[PDB]
Design a protein around this ligand. Structure first.
Ligand SMILES: Nc1ncnc2c1ncn2[C@@H]1O[C@H](COP(=O)(O)OP(=O)(O)OP(=O)(O)O)[C@@H](O)[C@H]1O
Ligand SMILES: [Mg+2]
Lengths: 172, 210, 125, 193, 52, 29, 52
């Protein structure tokens, strides 16, 4: 089946329409009587095709960036690793035992980021920046990406200052 | 005689489905043989290696950057063959026949297939004439007859090529002294080497005379 | 203007699929992604088979959306060559990464070429 | 149970359906009836979004998908081969195969009408006797009693003769290639002499 | 000097020691330079280090 | 084009033709 | 209907002994992939399975 031969099927070549009009008057009433069994269709949101091993396959999410924090509707974050033609493979920052097939995935619009600033100083956080020490949220803080590229050659100078460790073997 | 018997033969075509890494998957080419030389419209050749129900897998004899999706593949009708004969003596060819030494075409030569069935039982006789390599560690302890295959196996930079170059240079020294019937004509196949490594051997075989 | 400006089909790490609805770029050709945060050059590696080329990103693909306009440049990655490149630092795609200004180009050569022939070789020790 | 034999053999799982859909349409002489039945569903997917949602969306239930197609393919436009194909393709969720089961159906149909679509491209435009002559020359290249449907094109890089483009094979009877093979034979032979 | 997949600190080291010994000259003396540096160091993505 | 979503099919069954065959051939008269 | 969660326990209704499965992954197409806690010999495709 050549794509040259599948391109000619965009042009109409039916030469009789005796069941185009038959179902196009009957398609909508047959779709309407099954609305209890339709999940709402998904374009810019996502729906979990299959979850397992801590990797979910997500249908939809038409406008996610590669490497972006997505949020499952159970509040678990993910990261869109590979955008494919049919699905998005996301990597679940958490346990995948709370993600189901058919769950909603929400794009957040930002590549994977953590709270940085003076207000994270003193705190005990998890691998994604949420605090685990129990003393409330991270305040006086701002969001920045976790996969920043390192500075180049011209942005550096040689190390001069001596960074004391306090260990006699190391500092000597 | 050629013009009075000249039918311009039907050339079976094929479209390149995909191409990359020196493999072109080809739609069509339905009468192509296994191992048959095919020709792309870029001029670069190919060989149909695995014939499948939906496509042909064609290994590309050269750079695959000139092949595109939807390019035309023509089958040459012929299995892969090289020019053989005494006109190849003295010359430096590539992996299929074509000379790379800058001395024009191979005069006095004849094409024949590269995949020939080996001679069977009744086509042989016992290996009795000696092949002198000129290396006395070989010619004393592990001697080699004519028609014998001998593996030169070793580690990375041992004397493996140097044993084989000495077997070739020595045949030049014996060919001047033997009659014309028992002269040994050498072929050195250099696979995967540097191009300047083999330029050092053409320079060595020239200034020895081998 | 739409043809020979294809769109990003799928993004898997350093590897981008771009679908061109007509007249695919050649293998080793350079493609520019429009609208990225930085300059993202994609070198074509394979023709996948369904008007899709398979590309290698020369920078990060974090931020590629699956419809993004990708512009074919019709030629491989060409870097500035010459005596004007002496003393400069270049990256993979020939850009100055030493903040000394643009690079004085006597020529711009594609980074893909064949090896010299067997006749061109030198046997001098 | 042996069916009619297909004209040409095809590859699998989308052209294997078309090879069988052709065989149960040549049993009732419905080869041209189910063909535009196929073409109307190509058109129905261009119109209706809830009909193509029954072939792309993986989250429609298979109970729904086999009961929308069965509940619209009734009392008009059935043909009982189309009506049973698209309720079989909706059982397994294979309604997206409708485009390429149609394409390979035509390739069985066009080889059943015994036409080989052609392209003869010559140097100058043809007059009446050249057409009848190269049509008689070109019908010795069709591998049946096939009805060649010659197309005419112009290329003056050929210096007379013709080249026939069958889209599967090409026979180049042109005189530019006759000159090229002549010169290749001459330069081949004077170096053997 | 084609730096492929090495430390960016080492590229800065070589660049600064070449400016010191006058192998690389900056500004209007740039034409009297003797070395040109191409860098694809180990912070680059795999496509950049494969072509540098 | 609005028919590009059906360009290539996807199948959940290697033996799809074994299900189509038991529903197409009994449908002839 | 709706799928059980991963790690959820399922009871195979109708068997020789109590056959508990534990959901390992959601395979898509409304299938879960489970790992049995007893022998699966004697199990028929179409046997009713109750999610706990
Ligand atoms: N009989 C010998 N006497 C002295 N030196 C030798 C002898 N044979 C080889 N050599 C030296 O050893 C080096 C390796 O020889 P050679 O090129 O044969 O290595 P090799 O086994 O072919 O490995 P490679 O294929 O990696 O080159 C050569 O530079 C040669 O000078
Ligand atoms: Mg060697």
């Amino acid at each position: 089946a050549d794509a040259k031969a599948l391109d000619e099927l965009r042009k109409p070549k039916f030469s009789s329409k005796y069941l185009i009009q038959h179902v196009s008057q009957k398609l909508i009433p047959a779709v309407k009587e099954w609305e209890k069994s339709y999940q709402p269709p998904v374009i810019h949101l996502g729906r979990v095709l299959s979850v397992g091993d801590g990797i979910a396959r997500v249908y939809g999410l038409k406008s996610v960036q590669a490497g972006e924090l997505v949020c499952f509707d159970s509040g678990v974050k993910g990261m869109a690793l590979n955008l494919q033609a049919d699905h998005v493979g996301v990597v679940v920052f958490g346990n995948d035992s709370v993600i189901h097939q058919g769950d909603l995935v929400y794009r957040t619009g930002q590549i994977v980021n953590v709270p940085i600033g003076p207000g994270t100083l003193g705190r005990v956080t998890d691998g994604l920046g949420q605090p685990i020490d129990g003393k409330g949220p991270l305040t006086n803080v701002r969001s920045s990406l976790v996969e920043v590229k390192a500075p180049g050659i011209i942005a550096r100078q040689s190390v001069r200052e001596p960074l004391f460790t306090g260990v006699k073997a190391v500092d000597a | 005689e050629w013009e009075k018997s000249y039918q311009p033969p039907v050339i079976h075509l094929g479209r390149v489905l995909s191409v990359g890494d020196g493999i072109a998957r080809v739609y069509g080419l339905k009468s192509v043989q296994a191992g048959e030389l095919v020709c792309f419209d870029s001029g670069v050749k190919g060989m149909a290696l695995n014939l499948q129900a939906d496509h042909v897998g064609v290994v590309v004899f050269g750079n695959d950057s000139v092949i595109h999706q939807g390019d035309l593949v023509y089958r040459t009708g012929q299995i892969v063959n090289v020019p053989i004969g005494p006109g190849t003596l003295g010359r430096v060819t590539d992996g299929l026949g074509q000379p790379i030494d800058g001395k024009g075409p191979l005069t006095n030569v004849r094409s024949s297939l590269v995949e020939v069935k080996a001679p069977g039982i009744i086509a042989r006789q016992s290996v009795r004439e000696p092949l002198f390599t000129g290396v006395k560690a070989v010619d004393a302890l592990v001697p080699i007859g004519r028609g014998q295959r001998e593996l030169i196996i070793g580690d990375r930079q041992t004397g493996k090529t140097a044993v084989a170059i000495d077997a070739i240079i020595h045949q030049k020294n014996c060919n001047e002294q033997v009659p014309k019937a028992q002269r040994v004509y050498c072929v050195y196949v250099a696979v995967g080497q540097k191009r300047s490594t083999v330029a050092q051997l053409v320079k060595l075989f020239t200034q020895t005379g081998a | 203007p739409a043809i020979d400006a294809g769109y990003v089909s799928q993004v898997i790490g350093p590897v981008v699929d771009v679908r061109f609805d007509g007249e695919l770029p050649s293998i080793l050709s350079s493609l520019e992604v429009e609208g990225h945060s930085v300059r993202l050059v994609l070198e074509v590696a394979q023709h996948m088979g369904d008007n899709t080329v398979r590309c290698i990103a020369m920078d990060s693909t974090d931020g590629l959306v699956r419809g993004q306009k990708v512009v074919d440049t019709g030629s491989p990655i060409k870097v500035p060559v010459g005596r004007g490149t002496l003393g400069r630092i270049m990256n993979v795609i020939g850009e100055p990464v030493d903040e000394q200004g643009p690079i004085d180009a006597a020529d711009i050569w594609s980074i893909h070429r064949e090896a010299p022939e067997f006749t061109e070789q030198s046997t001098e020790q | 149970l042996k069916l009619p034999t297909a004209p040409l053999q095809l590859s699998g799982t989308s052209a294997q359906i078309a090879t069988l859909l052709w065989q149960v349409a040549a049993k009732e002489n419905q080869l041209d009836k189910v063909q535009d039945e196929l073409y109307q569903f190509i058109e129905l997917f261009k119109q209706h979004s809830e009909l193509r949602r029954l072939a792309t969306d993986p989250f429609v239930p298979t109970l729904v998908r086999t009961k929308i197609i069965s509940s619209v393919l009734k009392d008009s436009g059935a043909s009982e081969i189309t009506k049973k194909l698209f309720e079989a393709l909706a059982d397994e969720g294979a309604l997206s195969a409708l485009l390429e089961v149609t394409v390979n159906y035509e390739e069985l149909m066009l080889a059943h009408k015994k036409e080989v679509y052609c392209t003869v491209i010559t140097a100058e435009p043809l007059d009446k006797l050249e057409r009848v002559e190269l049509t008689k020359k070109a019908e010795k290249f069709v591998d049946a009693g096939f009805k060649l449907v010659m197309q005419e094109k112009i290329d003056k890089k050929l210096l007379g003769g013709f080249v026939i483009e069958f889209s599967d094979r090409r026979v180049d009877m042109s005189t530019a290639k006759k000159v090229e093979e002549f010169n290749n034979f001459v330069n081949k032979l004077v170096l053997s002499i | 000097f084609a730096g492929v997949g090495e430390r960016t600190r080492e590229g800065n080291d070589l660049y600064r020691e070449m400016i010191e010994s006058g192998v690389i000259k900056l500004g209007a003396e740039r034409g009297n330079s003797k070395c040109t540096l191409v860098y694809g160091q180990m912070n680059e993505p795999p496509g950049a280090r494969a072509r540098v």
